[PDB]
């Protein structure tokens, strides 16, 4: 089977630079320790404006993740989470960027759980990921769990069940649930 892995990081100002560094480094480790067959990686940084830091084509041609992740900055915008997702499903999972049909499609949403200024809601874009069939792993950060409505924003983003998908970034055993879900898949 075909392992298509996408990565969506928040860059909003609410992301303190230390949270942000953890994100970039955790992603790079996620890919690194996901060194395994037939896995493809693409990334976009999301805030109030979006910019895909690498596509799948650019990844099959460049396997070194550290080379892909170093140049990434913070955006310091607003937080258009909902809009970011249609940018993931409509662009990253397009055949034009490398997307293969009948592949295991996973989205890694890495944010603190605070959408703001987004004109789009979730009731259009979440059922979209499900009608397209993308299994959504969410990685909350900093104080993504201090508040109540943030952490539920996460389960709102994460596919069900959220206990199996919602994880903190510093936790090192966020991969093994998925690293393993493929070993006989």
């Amino acid at each position: 089977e075909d392992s298509d892995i996408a990565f969506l990081i928040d860059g909003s100002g609410s992301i303190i630079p230390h949270d942000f560094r953890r994100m970039k480094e955790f992603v790079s480790t996620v890919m690194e320790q996901l060194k395994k067959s037939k896995t493809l990686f693409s990334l976009m940084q999301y805030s109030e404006e979006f910019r895909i830091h690498f596509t799948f084509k650019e990844f099959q041609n460049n396997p070194n993740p550290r080379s892909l992740v170093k140049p990434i900055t913070q955006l310091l915008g607003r937080t258009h989470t909902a809009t970011g997702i249609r940018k993931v499903v409509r662009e990253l999972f397009n055949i034009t960027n490398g997307a293969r049909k009948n592949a295991f499609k996973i989205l890694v949403v890495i944010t603190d759980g605070e959408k703001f200024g987004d004109p789009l809601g979730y009731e259009d874009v979440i059922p979209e990921a499900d009608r397209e069939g993308v299994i959504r792993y969410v990685i909350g950060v900093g104080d993504a769990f201090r508040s109540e409505k943030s952490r539920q924003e996460l389960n709102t983003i994460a596919s069900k069940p959220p206990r199996d998908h919602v994880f903190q970034v510093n936790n090192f055993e966020a991969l093994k649930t998925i690293q393993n879900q493929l070993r006989e898949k």
Binding site: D130, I135, S159, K160, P161
Partner: protein
């Protein structure tokens, strides 16, 4: 053989709408399996004429050629009651079988 439909992730308290579930099917080798999931709310409206493996055998056992649970009046009827014909060179033979359906007339 055997066909079984059970969950494949016992480690779940209660399924949640939208969630993926691992379904463990055990079965005969090389078989084609035909599936259905029904809202049990349907059965609240109607549950007549639903399919069972035992309804299937009812059909087959109903189709049996024998027409008696036991013996017959003589050597011959034991065979014919069982759905058999016996014929020997000496002349002893089962009666004739002239009907596809069992001999109770108007039954």
């Amino acid at each position: 053989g055997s066909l079984v439909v059970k969950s494949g992730q016992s480690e779940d308290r209660q399924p949640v709408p939208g969630q993926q579930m691992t379904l463990k099917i055990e079965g005969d080798h090389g078989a084609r399996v035909v599936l259905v999931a029904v809202d049990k709310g349907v059965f609240v409206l109607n549950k007549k004429n639903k399919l069972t493996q035992s309804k299937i055998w009812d059909v087959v056992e109903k189709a049996d050629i024998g027409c008696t649970p036991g013996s017959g009046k003589d050597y011959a009827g034991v065979f014919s009651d069982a759905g058999l014909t016996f014929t020997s060179s000496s002349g002893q033979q089962t009666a004739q079988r002239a009907e596809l359906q069992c001999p109770q007339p108007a039954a």
